[PDB]
Design a protein around this ligand. Structure first.
Ligand SMILES: CC(=O)N[C@H]1[C@H](O[C@H]2[C@H](O)[C@H]3N=C(C)S[C@H]3O[C@@H]2CO)O[C@H](CO)[C@@H](O)[C@@H]1O
Length: 538
């Protein structure tokens, strides 16, 4: 007689190759990379002979075997590839093998190979597009948007993007290194806790709870090895294998450490830590560098040096050489990109015609041209062109594109930015010829989340009725709303200015469009990016 049929013992079924320690706040303790998951299976034999060999099978294939020595047994073995496996215990003797019923086990890896695909329906006004224009359609998802903004990875209209940027991955450093974070309550202290025992100038995760642990759709079971934004991005990657998901390093409040990378010791340490970050988190497809800005004039008034352009070029070159190596080891295509000032004065601090040789795309931040940071000089915050009243306006999309083109940047590298938010002023007064921009303001407009800034969702839903005047400036390619009684003025992108930008990209053979930030759109802005770049509906 063959052995009796074993019964798998109840026990944990989810294991991880990269493990997240559930009680640690320092990135170095939080994340344990192993060569393989340590899997454990037990069984009982309730009827028959226990056989002479016990085997654990994963989809029929032996991962462990040993002597079958009693009515119950335990196998501890390593599994080096992620997935969901039909596991069985089989008991064998000379007369045959008898296999248990299959139990599914999870062997988690950060490519999301153990996860069901996160395929969610489009929400709000989002309509389906195919990505067939061959142009970039990008947007940023922000890590902290899962809190007050309540906008999670399952709400991303992912089929409508080619590029999804994760803002932001910080670089470790305390006093003197990340001083700009101190302007945000608790933010500098959160980074120091995350970076404790970790060298300055290495990357980390700013909010490991939101990134890895917060229950979210598809990752709510307590034993799920990855949860939060990363666990959902892994599952999104299963649903959208051609979507490029890039970690964005820097941004407004996390750019200070770039200013030190003229020291090759620090720069080498940074690049090596980026490599390790991509080996650890396999769902990411490259790296986006958002250094605001070489030369300074970013958040920190004390940083910026004439050397920064040279540092930037060297950095892009070294990141490229690291990515070409990773790409060789893995067989994957990795991308290197950068979000950059669209102001000619910042553009001319960098030789982009040299750095473009290392880079896949340049995200031109053709927005924030004007806003409540200047109450005196009012203007269109994200316009294509100068307006009729001031044809020599410095800060326009076209002036940034032409600055790059004049350096000798190739048109196909350049991705034009659109805003999914408005900036505005209150108390605008002293304007002439019915153009509020010719006046001056007394303060910022009341914002959705902070003063002077309104989600595109709120503009469309609250500010396109009642007393609000609406004008589309067809010279600048720029809409604006104005409430004269309070003097509230908001400058923003809408479906039409986005269509102008998209048409311009096609005419000038540029690379495509990107937007900041995805949670703020109701679908109008992203629908228009897709349509205007010539993506097919459906
Ligand atoms: C209006 C807003 O959302 N402000 C954010 C800020 O967003 C910057 C961003 O850092 C900069 N980087 C890009 C990439 S696009 C570009 O513009 C946006 C909007 O002006 O980000 C910081 C953190 O860097 C937040 O504190 C702030 O909420």
């Amino acid at each position: 007689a063959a052995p009796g049929k074993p019964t798998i013992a109840w026990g944990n079924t989810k294991f991880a190759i990269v493990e997240v320690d559930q009680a640690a706040t320092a990135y170095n303790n939080l994340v344990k990379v192993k060569n393989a998951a340590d899997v454990s299976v037990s069984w009982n034999l309730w009827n028959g002979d226990t056989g002479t060999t016990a085997k654990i099978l994963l989809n029929g294939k032996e991962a462990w075997s040993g002597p079958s020595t009693g009515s119950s047994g335990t196998a501890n073995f390593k599994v080096n590839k992620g997935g969901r496996y039909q596991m069985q215990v089989a008991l064998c003797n000379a007369d045959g093998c008898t296999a248990s019923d299959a139990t599914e086990i999870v062997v988690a890896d950060t490519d999301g190979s153990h996860l069901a695909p996160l395929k969610e329906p489009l929400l709000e006004k989002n309509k389906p597009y195919k990505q067939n224009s061959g142009k970039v359609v990008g947007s940023y998802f922000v890590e902290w948007g899962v809190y007050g903004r309540n906008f999670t990875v399952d709400k991303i209209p992912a089929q409508n993007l080619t590029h999804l940027l994760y803002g932001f991955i910080p670089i470790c450093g305390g006093n003197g290194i990340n001083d700009s974070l101190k302007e945000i309550e608790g933010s500098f202290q959160a980074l120091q806790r995350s970076c404790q025992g970790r060298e300055d100038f290495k990357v980390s995760i700013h909010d490991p709870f939101a990134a890895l642990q917060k229950a979210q759709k598809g990752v709510t079971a307590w034993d799920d090895p990855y949860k939060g934004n990363f666990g959902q991005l892994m599952a999104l990657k299963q649903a959208h294998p051609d979507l490029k998901i890039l970690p964005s390093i820097g941004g407004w409040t996390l750019s200070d450490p770039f200013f030190f990378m003229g020291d090759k010791v620090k720069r080498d340490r940074f690049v090596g830590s980026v490599k390790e970050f991509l080996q650890t988190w396999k769902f990411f497809d490259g790296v986006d560098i958002d250094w605001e800005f070489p030369g300074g004039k970013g958040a920190n008034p004390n940083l910026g040096s004439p050397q920064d352009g040279e540092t930037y070029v060297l950095l892009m070159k070294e990141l490229r050489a690291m990515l070409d190596q990773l790409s060789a080891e893995t067989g994957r295509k990795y991308e290197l990109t950068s979000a950059i000032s669209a102001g000619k004065d910042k553009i001319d601090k960098v030789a982009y015609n040299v750095a473009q040789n290392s880079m896949d795309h340049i995200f031109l931040m053709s927005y924030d041209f004007y806003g409540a940071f200047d109450l005196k000089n009012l203007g269109h915050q994200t316009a294509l062109n100068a307006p009729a009243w001031k044809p020599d306006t410095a800060y326009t999309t076209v002036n940034g594109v032409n600055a790059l083109l004049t350096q000798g940047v190739k048109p196909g590298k350049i991705v034009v930015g659109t805003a999914m938010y408005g900036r505005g002023w209150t108390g605008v007064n002293g304007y002439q010829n019915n153009i509020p921009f010719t006046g001056t303001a007394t303060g910022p407009v009341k914002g959705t989340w902070e003063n002077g800034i309104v989600d595109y969702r709120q503009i469309a839903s609250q500010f396109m009725s009642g007393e609000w005047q609406y004008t589309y400036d067809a010279t600048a390619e720029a809409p604006y709303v104005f409430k004269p009684s309070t003097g509230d003025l908001i400058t923003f992108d809408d479906a039409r200015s986005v269509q102008a930008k998209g048409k311009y990209v096609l005419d000038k053979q540029l690379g495509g469009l990107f937007s900041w930030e995805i949670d703020a759109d109701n679908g109008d802005i992203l629908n228009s990016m897709n349509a205007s770049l010539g993506n097919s509906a459906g």
